[PDB]
Ligand binder design. Structure first.
Ligand code: HEA
Ligand code: HEA
Ligand SMILES: CCCCCCCc1c(I)c(=O)c2ccccc2n1O
Ligand SMILES: [Cu+2]
Lengths: 70, 256, 178, 607
């Protein structure tokens, strides 16, 4: 019931993503996965769980933007 | 030798650090045998050791980019540098002249080396000149050099090992401009078209004067695919055990 | 209580660096194809692929929350986990015919350097979603001589969140390659 | 070819010796209490005993290399031999020696100092050893069966595919490390959860004490700096076998793209080889000194700096390939910002050793020599960080002389420190101390006269990866002195093995066990600790022991024979793809078939 609200909102991001082509388009992609993954991390084993993927995306920015940086 | 002053000045900077820890161990320890505020105050000196180098090094990285230790702003001489396996290639675009495994340059004249390599990635070290930058197969890298004084400059390759790579030592001589203008040609053989393809095989070679430039062949600095049209057009691909000796099909110019 | 939910969770964070390495490889090999075929792919197939997977998580975000957590639909495990299992074959079947149709000029990784990354950035991509189907159906063999209760049969949740990590880079691929 | 004909008979002899002398009946002790065992204590033993085996394999390599490099015009090794020997020597270390030696010292000491039973997943940690071991036998069978790689431990792409030419050469380097990368990745996942959710009551997070903290940082970088290597070789494995053009020169692929992927994994993994080396030395220098590790808000806070700042510095191995200048100064300033979080950790061992007492034993000498020798190499890498001056001493031995002072003093000494200091844990008694000093002194003095002349060898003008120098300005003796010191370190490994033929001032849960060789369940009751150092507060202050009638049940994580069969499938598929089988593998697909069948058995076995 509560998860149906996020699933319906996620579909609009992909439809709006096609409208961008057919920064400004690099943040809608991460925001699509923020709502997708925020319904199953906290808590109990949280903080470490949601924190492990936090610096993992840091490496994704470091590896991608670092390779393009040359 | 522009960065050599860094090496000598930094050598004493770390020689102090080596003796500092001699005073932090040998002074006590022997005396001390059976028979919170200091750490935070220590964080003022370690940047001072690196920030005294995080400025002149950065003031030198940007220094080797633009016109370096030579001309100031005139006399633009270009020398295309290509590196085959074992063997080194240098072509002069100024006049149709092309030399391999030997190079002569005028003192106090800038030489804009265009660096690339055909068969394997490599880099023209030339230890007396100083900075050396990789020759990447697929693109040409611009590098500026000069010859400080007249002499015999040993030159070499970084030797990313590949069997016959140790004897990549090509001695380069740098003489006066007056002798160079007579020597810019010895006598500008010629570009025999086929002998260029006879170079990409990794063996041993002598001087080979060649009085004509090769940049008329796919630039070579661009389109590094000139490795299949080289070793394979003459029928040759090596292995590790037996049946080598360039798998048959002769025609070349070797030693002895 | 099982720590496998967290141990196999930091493994999902390791795959972030796994796909970032392939994304760094692909983004540098983007301006190549100096001698080959220029990329021109079907647009509607990309949305159909993404909309099928965006509805795949739609039937899975509420597939364990209003399933095992809210109330107790033990009979619905052969319903919600099976329907979400057929959608996994939709992405596999569509990507296979996408690769088979790519045989017509631009086949495999031998035509150009760019197509090497695309067929690999979507390669293990296609492998991770393929082994997940055999992992989601591997836990479905429990409603027989086992049939464990929630908060005990962790095999469903640890395989559901790994299945959720796919759509993370799946959309990042949608913006990455397209 | 003449030398490689003798060892293939000796390799068949050692296998034949196992059948007669050992295999009288081993399906009761070898297959039961070993091979597929689950106890973490027995797994870490199999890790370091392989590194000692690789120490002799890498030992005869390192000796005959410098023996060949004794003087110019020497005819010991030809071109295609010295190229394969020095590549095997470097790859046997770090990957197949320092990694199993460090993880082995981690897979044994860490789970005891935390009070827990085993690790997080003692089942996945079982295959985590064999996943490396089948990768070690893969890389070792390149001896006479196929051909050892000859592109260096880096093995750049433009000299690895067709320009290289040996078929079964680079494939061993690709499939050998690809399997071990899976086992090492799970080793970092097991201990990241083992130290986070399996600690005992009272063991606070900020104090547990410091070596276990380095292990925590060791297994954090593995999780984020090993999936890169998993695809960096997978991309290269596609170029060699499946005909991909990721970095091939022909189809136009970027030749340097494989370099950054290897170094994005390289330098962060380079700290994975020095992080447990720092941890093992952190306890020994603070245990026999009978003092407290003065400094935690700036020492554990410094261990997190190099954990995140290891991925903003990896572009320090390039510099020489024409970058964007500013990006060559960004990672040049940043590399200076890495020798500061590491630099504060040397000033933390000398003030924990002062004011307090000390007793020079054998494990102390390894910590005594670790302080200067690691700095003498560290006062050189600072020069390597200077990108403006890195162009002059790039490669040319000065690079080799810097790092050999860094890793051998850092890790190899820690591999020797943890070898002796935690030897009573493995079996009864320990090593003889007085004759153990003979091994320390000879191995120490030969280490300096081997690589400090290399500082002069490299600065004068001797490049690396060269089989003959030539009479250049009389720089022959500096190369021979480096060989004398090289062969001097060889003298000692015989002493090291002679010491093993014989067959304490603790401050943590080391000697807190019930007795020597601790039992399977390890610790009958979990210690309350509730302090920074448990053993000292549980000796003079009160007593606190394992009182009877307070015991309970067992753990019961018994053995399963799948981890051995699972890694055999990886070793079978790896060997099938390497030894010939260029385009596709007939038996390489079976290994994936056997693995996925066992991965179904993974979640089909109830326990
Ligand atoms: C863990 C790091 C590590 C360790 C421990 C060693 C161990 C040694 N290494 Fe090595 N080395 C590297 C890291 C290491 N090395 C790396 C990274 C490369 C380059 C890799 C590449 O790019 O390919 C390299 C290669 C390399 C070079 C550079 C090659 C070149 O540039 O041309 C040199 C220089 O002399 C060297 C020497 C030695 C010596 C003398 C030892 C000593 O420690 C030897 C130790 C030996 C023993 C402890 C046992 C002694 C053996 C015996 C006693 C048996 C004797 C019996 C008979 C001879 C029958 N090795
Ligand atoms: C254990 C692994 C390990 C560790 C810990 C280090 C530590 C460091 N390394 Fe190195 N390095 C290697 C493994 C390692 N390295 C390997 C394997 C290679 C060769 C790879 C190959 O090509 O095959 C290499 C080569 C290498 C390069 C590449 C050279 C090239 O391009 O060819 C560079 C460049 O910056 C470098 C620098 C440093 C610095 C600045 C540190 C610092 O972390 C060191 C910190 C220590 C100090 C800074 C000194 C102690 C500090 C003090 C006493 C405080 C006071 C000092 C100051 C204030 C300066 N080393
Ligand atoms: C021991 C040994 C010998 I003797 C060799 O000839 C050799 C040759 C190539 C590669 C590795 C080698 N190793 O490891
Ligand atoms: Cu580095």
């Amino acid at each position: 019931x509560x998860x149906x609200x996020x699933x319906x909102x996620x579909x609009x991001x992909x439809x709006x993503x096609x409208x961008x082509x057919x920064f400004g388009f690099a943040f809608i992609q991460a925001a699509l996965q923020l709502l997708m993954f925020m319904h199953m991390t906290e808590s109990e084993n949280g903080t470490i769980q949601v924190g492990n993927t936090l610096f993992g995306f840091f490496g994704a920015i470091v590896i991608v933007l670092g390779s393009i940086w040359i | 030798q522009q960065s050599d002053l860094i090496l000598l000045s930094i050598g004493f900077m770390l020689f102090i650090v080596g003796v500092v820890f001699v005073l932090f161990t040998i002074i006590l320890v022997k005396y001390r045998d059976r028979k919170t505020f200091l750490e935070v105050v220590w964080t003022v000196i370690p940047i001072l050791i690196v920030i005294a180098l995080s400025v002149p090094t950065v003031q030198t990285i940007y220094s080797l980019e633009k016109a370096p230790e030579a001309t100031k702003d005139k006399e633009p001489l270009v020398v295309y540098a290509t590196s085959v396996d074992w063997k080194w290639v240098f072509s002069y675009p100024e006049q149709d002249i092309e030399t391999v495994n030997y190079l002569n340059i005028p003192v106090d004249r800038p030489i804009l080396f265009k660096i690339s390599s055909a068969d394997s990635m490599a880099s023209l070290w030339i230890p007396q000149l100083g900075g050396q930058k990789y020759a990447m197969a697929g693109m040409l890298m611009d590098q500026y050099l000069q010859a400080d004084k007249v002499g015999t400059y040993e030159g070499r390759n970084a030797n990313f090992t590949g069997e016959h790579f140790a004897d990549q030592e090509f001695d380069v001589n740098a003489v006066t401009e007056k002798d160079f203008n007579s020597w810019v040609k010895k006598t500008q053989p010629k570009l025999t078209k086929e002998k260029y393809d006879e170079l990409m095989l990794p063996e041993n070679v002598d001087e080979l004067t060649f009085s004509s430039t090769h940049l008329k062949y796919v630039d070579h600095g661009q389109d590094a695919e000139y490795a299949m049209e080289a070793r394979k057009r003459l029928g040759y691909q090596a292995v590790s055990p037996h049946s080598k000796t360039d798998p048959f099909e002769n025609v070349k110019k070797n030693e002895f | 209580g099982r720590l496998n939910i967290l141990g196999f969770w930091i493994f999902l964070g390791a795959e972030i660096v796994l796909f970032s390495t392939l994304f760094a490889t692909f983004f540098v090999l983007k301006n190549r194809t100096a001698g080959g075929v220029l990329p021109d792919e079907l647009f509607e197939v990309n949305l159909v692929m993404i909309m099928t997977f965006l509805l795949l998580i739609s039937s899975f975000t509420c597939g364990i929350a209003v399933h095992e957590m809210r109330r107790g639909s033990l009979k619905g495990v052969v319903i919600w986990t099976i329907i979400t299992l057929l959608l996994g074959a939709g992405f596999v079947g569509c990507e296979i015919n996408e690769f088979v149709h790519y045989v017509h000029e631009g086949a495999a990784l031998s035509t150009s350097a760019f197509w090497s990354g695309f067929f690999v950035l979507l390669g293990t991509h296609g492998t991770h979603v393929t082994i997940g189907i055999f992992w989601i159906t591997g836990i479905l063999i429990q409603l027989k001589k086992r049939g464990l209760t929630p908060q005990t049969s962790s095999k469903i949740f640890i395989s559901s969140l790994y299945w959720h990590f796919l759509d993370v880079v799946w959309i990042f691929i949608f913006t990455g390659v397209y | 070819p003449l030398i490689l004909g003798a060892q293939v008979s000796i390799a068949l002899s050692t296998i034949a010796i196992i059948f007669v002398l050992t295999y009288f009946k081993k399906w009761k002790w070898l297959w039961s209490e070993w091979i597929t065992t689950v106890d973490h204590k027995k797994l870490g033993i199999m890790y370091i005993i392989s590194a000692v085996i690789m120490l002799f394999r890498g030992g005869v390599d390192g000796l005959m290399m410098r023996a060949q490099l004794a003087l110019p015009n020497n005819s010991f090794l030809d071109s295609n031999h010295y190229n394969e020997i020095f590549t095997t020597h470097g790859t046997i270390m770090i990957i197949f020696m320092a990694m199993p030696f460090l993880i082995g010292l981690i897979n044994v000491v860490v789970p005891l100092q935390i009070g827990a039973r085993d690790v997080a997943f003692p089942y996945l940690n079982n295959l985590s050893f064999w996943t490396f071991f089948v990768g070690a036998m893969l890389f070792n069978i390149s001896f006479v069966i196929g051909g050892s790689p000859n592109a260096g431990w880096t093995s750049y792409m433009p000299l690895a595919s067709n320009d290289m030419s040996p078929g079964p050469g680079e494939n061993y380097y690709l499939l050998g490390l690809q399997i071990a990368g899976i086992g090492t990745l799970m080793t970092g996942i097991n201990f990241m959860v083992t130290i986070l959710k399996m600690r005992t009551k009272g063991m606070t997070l900020m104090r547990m004490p410091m070596f276990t903290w380095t292990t925590l940082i060791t297994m954090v970088i593995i999780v984020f700096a090993f999936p890169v290597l998993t695809v960096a070789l997978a991309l290269l494995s596609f170029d060699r076998l499946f005909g991909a053009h990721f970095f091939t020169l022909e189809a136009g692929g970027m030749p340097m793209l494989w370099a950054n992927l290897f170094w994005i994994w390289g330098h962060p993994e380079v700290y994975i080889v020095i992080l447990p080396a720092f941890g093992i030395f952190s306890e020994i220098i603070s245990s026999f000194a009978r003092k407290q590790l003065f400094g935690y808000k700036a020492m554990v806070g410094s261990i997190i700096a190099i954990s995140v700042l290891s991925f903003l510095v990896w572009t320090h191995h390039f510099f020489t390939m024409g970058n964007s200048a500013s990006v060559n100064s960004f990672f040049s300033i940043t590399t200076m910002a890495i020798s500061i979080p590491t630099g504060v950790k040397i000033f933390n061992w000398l003030f924990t050793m002062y004011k307090g007492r000390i007793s020079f034993t054998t494990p102390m000498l390894w910590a005594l020599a670790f302080i200067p020798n690691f700095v003498i190499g560290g006062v050189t890498g600072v020069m390597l960080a200077m990108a403006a001056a890195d162009y002059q001493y790039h490669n040319t031995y000065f690079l080799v002389s810097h790092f050999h002072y860094v890793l051998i003093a850092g890790t190899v000494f820690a591999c020797f420190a943890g070898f002796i200091f935690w030897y009573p844990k493995m079996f009864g008694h320990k090593l003889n101390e007085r004759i153990g000093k003979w091994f320390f002194w000879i191995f120490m003095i030969g280490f300096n006269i081997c690589f400090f002349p290399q500082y002069f060898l490299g600065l004068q003008g001797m490049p690396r990866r060269i089989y003959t120098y030539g009479p250049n300005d009389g720089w022959t003796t500096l190369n021979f002195i480096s060989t004398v010191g090289a062969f001097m370190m060889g003298v000692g490994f015989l002493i090291l093995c002679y010491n093993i033929y014989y067959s304490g001032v603790g401050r943590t849960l080391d000697w807190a066990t019930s007795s020597a060789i601790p039992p399977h369940y390890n610790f009958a009751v979990l210690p309350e600790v509730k302090s920074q150092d448990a053993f000292l507060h549980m000796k003079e202050e009160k007593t606190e022991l394992y009182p009877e009638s307070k015991f309970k049940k067992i753990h019961m994580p018994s053995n399963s024979g799948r981890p051995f069969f699972m890694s055999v499938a990886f070793g079978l598929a790896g060997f099938g793809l390497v030894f010939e089988w260029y385009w596709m593998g007939v038996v390489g697909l079976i290994g994936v078939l056997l693995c996925m069948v066992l991965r179904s058995f993974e979640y089909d076995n109830g326990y």
